Design a protein around this ligand. Structure first.
Ligand code: LMN
Lengths: 48, 367, 76, 48
């Protein structure tokens, strides 16, 4: 196994595609601020 | 194989730390009085022949792999009168200094950590009668065997324990062919609150409460030859974890484990006698034994043979032990070796335990 | 003494300064061979394959001149 | 202490390719073994 649940090893991700490279679901093809209009909040951590 | 071993914290308290007792099959509760008699039976410290003594003992772990992983012990006893004695010991199991590096730069400050586990105890032994003595010991045990990383806390876990010991040594009684000596001893060890490594009251582990009862007889020949044959029985005072189930499938196991872990140590000591489907015939299996014979020549040469047997269903640590001891003027050197006889790889195999003791002060006669 | 062991993240990088690594043996505190590379012949080693059920693990490396050097490391 | 950089693999270069494989799982109250890539389910009843 390769452990992938380290908290500090994950960072904020880019806008993804949901079906294919031609899928404009989360406005991933947008070249403006609309590229980030579908980003909801996400906190990734490990409770101290 | 091993069925339902007892899960107790700080197990290193149950490991022999001195070469003399380790050469006797890990028994010291009924043997002759010595400086190392703190882990086994402090009550015979009042029967020591010398005013005071110090001792350093070494037990290497994984000798073939690497050094600095070992259990050391420093003991110091001193009897002020012929009836009382104060002793203090310090056991320390450590992996040695370990460097933490995450960069290949030669010029890079490296953090050195030594995951360790020590126990410092002090005992007072009072000779009540002319042949019987008692002893009370208080021990503080700290464990720092983990390394601090992200989301992991390496805070040391500490606990306290109380040991009550008693030792009886009759006078030299003459027989048809020899003038032997009878000895007996009992010791209840590690009586204290649970130690929590996670620093949570819900997840706490019982201290390895132990009960040792031993007896021995010494045959004396020619006034300068001794042969002491001793036998010790050892039993843990911790309730046995549930096995298959004692009420779906995993619900019974979870309920049994929750009931087992929600038991106080005071209640657990009394619950140790039983808590199993088997009767007294199966309850006798919980008692391990050790039989040893020590030959003393001129009180300066010692050859020790021992056989220590645990139950195959728990622990399963059966072995023989050889030991030698030499006293030149005031320094006793003891070396012990272990021949395993169990199906499980004993971590003490190919290990020559060492002990070095200096005895000094006035000499007290032995009754 | 010539070797620079390092454990960054689930990997054990072994570099031998001015020498050639011959074999690397990795042991847990139990004494079990969790890794063995009998044949490398290279200056740089990168295991990146340990399971390491515990934290402290022992590595033993011998060079081309038969220099048995053991260095305890903590798995990160 | 590390600065926030748009470079996750620490190769000093910011990749802009979007060639990947997409897997998905559902998060539903009534998930059961045998579907949705579920291989085992462990139920704990009495948690302190
Ligand atoms: C918690 C432990 C505290 C530490 C205790 C150390 C005690 C040191 C005392 C040295 C000693 C004990 C051997 C210990 C060696 C073990 C070292 C372990 C090393 C581990 C790696 C060695 O003495 C022996 O060794 C020889 C040295 O070669 C001596 O030669 C000569 O040595 C020199 C003249 O003695 C010459 O200068 C040198 O020219 C000679 O050659 C000989 O006299 C003798 O054979 C002798 O003990 C005696 O000294 C007195 C001093 O006050 C001690 O007083 C005690 O102090 C407190 C006790 O602490 C007690 O409270 C206290 O009540 C009590 O009054 C007593 O003990 C006493 O009996």
């Amino acid at each position: 196994t390769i452990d992938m649940r380290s908290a500090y090893a994950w960072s904020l991700a880019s806008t993804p595609f949901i079906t294919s490279i031609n899928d404009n679901t989360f406005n991933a093809n947008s070249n403006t601020l609309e590229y980030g209009f579908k980003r909801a909040k996400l906190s990734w951590y490990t409770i101290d | 194989d091993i069925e339902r071993p007892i899960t107790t914290g700080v197990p290193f308290l149950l490991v022999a730390a001195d070469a003399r007792a380790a050469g006797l099959g890990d028994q010291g509760v009924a043997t002759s009085s010595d400086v190392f008699s703190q882990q086994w039976n402090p009550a015979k410290y009042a029967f020591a022949e010398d005013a005071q003594g110090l001792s350093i003992s070494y037990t290497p772990y994984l000798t073939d792999l690497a050094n600095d992983i070992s259990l050391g012990q420093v003991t110091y006893y001193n009897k002020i009168n012929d009836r009382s004695a104060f002793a203090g010991s310090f056991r320390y199991f450590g992996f040695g200094g370990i460097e933490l590096r995450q960069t290949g730069d030669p010029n890079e400050p490296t953090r050195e950590v030594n995951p360790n586990e020590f126990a410092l105890d002090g005992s007072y032994s009072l000779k009540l009668s002319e042949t019987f003595s008692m002893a009370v010991a208080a021990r503080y045990i700290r464990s720092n065997l983990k390394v601090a990383t992200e989301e992991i806390d390496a805070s040391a876990a500490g606990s306290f324990a109380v040991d009550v010991a008693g030792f009886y040594q009759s006078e030299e009684i003459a027989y048809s062919d020899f003038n032997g000596r009878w000895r007996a001893g009992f010791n209840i060890q590690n009586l204290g609150p649970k130690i929590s490594y996670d620093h949570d009251d819900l997840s706490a582990n019982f201290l390895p409460a132990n009960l040792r009862v031993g007896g021995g007889f010494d045959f004396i020949f020619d006034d300068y030859n001794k042969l002491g044959v001793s036998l010790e029985l050892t039993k843990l005072l911790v309730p046995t974890p549930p096995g298959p189930g004692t009420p779906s499938q995993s619900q019974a196991d979870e309920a049994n484990y929750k009931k087992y872990k929600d038991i106080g140590w005071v209640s657990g000591i009394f619950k140790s006698f039983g808590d199993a489907p088997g009767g007294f015939s199966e309850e006798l299996k919980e008692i391990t034994y050790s039989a040893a014979a020590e030959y003393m020549y001129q009180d300066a040469f010692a050859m020790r043979l021992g056989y220590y047997h645990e139950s195959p269903m728990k622990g399963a640590k059966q072995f023989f032990s050889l030991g030698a001891g030499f006293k030149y003027s005031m320094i006793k050197v003891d070396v012990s070796y272990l021949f395993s006889a169990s199906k499980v790889k004993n971590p003490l195999e190919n290990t020559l335990r060492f002990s070095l003791t200096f005895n000094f002060g006035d000499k007290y006669e032995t009754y | 003494d010539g070797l620079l062991i390092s454990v960054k993240d689930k990997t054990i990088k072994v570099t031998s300064a001015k020498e050639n690594i011959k074999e690397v043996n990795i042991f847990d505190i139990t004494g079990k061979l969790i890794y063995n590379k009998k044949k490398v012949g290279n200056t740089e080693l990168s295991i990146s394959n340990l399971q390491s059920a515990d934290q402290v693990l022992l590595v033993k490396v011998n060079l081309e001149n038969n220099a048995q050097i053991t260095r305890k490391v903590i798995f990160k | 202490t590390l600065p926030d950089v748009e470079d996750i693999n620490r190769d000093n270069t910011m990749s802009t390719i979007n060639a990947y494989y997409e897997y998905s799982i559902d998060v539903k109250p009534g998930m059961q073994v045998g579907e949705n890539y579920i291989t085992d389910i462990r139920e704990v009843t009495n948690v302190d």
